[PDB]
Amino acid sequence: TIKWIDWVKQIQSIAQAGLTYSKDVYDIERFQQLRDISISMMSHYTKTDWEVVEKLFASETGYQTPKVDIRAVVFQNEKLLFVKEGKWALPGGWADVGYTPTEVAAKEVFEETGYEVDHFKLLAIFDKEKHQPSPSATHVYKIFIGCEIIGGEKKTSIETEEVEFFGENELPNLSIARNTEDQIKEMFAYMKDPQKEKLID
Template sequence: MNDVVRWARALQALSQTGLEYAAGPYDRERYEAVQRIAVEMAAWAGGEEPAELLASFAEESGYRTPKVDVRGVVLGAEGLLLVREPDSDGWCLPGGWADVGETPSRAVEKEVGEEAGISARAVRLLGIFDRDFRGRLRWPAHVYKLYLQCEPLGGTPTPDGVETEAAGYFPLDTLPSLSAKTPPEQLSRALAVAADPAVAAAFD
């Protein structure tokens, strides 16, 4: 299944880039055919409707590049700050998509404040990882996840009631079950960097 998703993602990127730079109608027809193949593969792998996927693919244009997901590693006196999203099977680091025009530090500070109710300041890059898609059924874009250590400045963990339904600090030795948005192996690598100021940021 992971191979099918990877192939579909590569074909989607190829078709999107090809459509952007197509030299004529015959080139466009070929890249549109590649896009339809990518849709069929992605729909089969993720159980989604081909028509919805095709519309989603068509909204993307230009040279295909990875999206950026920022995650705040907020370490306080009580442990690590985590949030729980509605209908989620576990907890994750607060964060989300970086908006165009935002710096990574500003993006993660905003996400921590909105999702967990904590005012924080980004102080250090801990890692840049390729997003892990294991167990994710919905169509995945290619994503780079940025883990940034954040210093808590104030506030009480409070969910926003929309994107998050719970928030709290957890001791590092008794973390709850994590959702797919915070793969345990990535979190372990980020925490190892956070524990030693002399260690450089991790990356895939």
């Protein structure tokens, strides 16, 4: 059983909430001890240095929420834009503090593919843990944002495939952690019927 990961994540979350919102000096101390217990548990059961765990798992301030991943959905002539890491994914990544969702989509498409995009559409919000589960210290929500190409040009790569458009019947090897087969299928379903229901987990 690896149910304990969930438990320890819960304890850290509640301790972090207490550290953020408690106004009682003694209860703040109690929440600090609880956070430290959660780090100790995580450190022992992942055989990871305590200070490394503190940094990666228990150094956020404010209430602990899921993290935000952005994926840009860019179509051209019924084909969808993917970028190769050797597995493939839609342009995107973590939402950077200080950027709006569309600003992240724009930046990532430009940086990863060379294209300039605009005319944003909210397409889906998927729960990463529901769709592409993996033992994880965190929780991620994935915002899928449709974009129109208005400028730039596709990056080229010598002797390799790195940035390409793919049709629904010729999908490359997917990075499932970043996009599942059915998440991609849903984007093609949107392309075929743009007025359809926009999915939320």
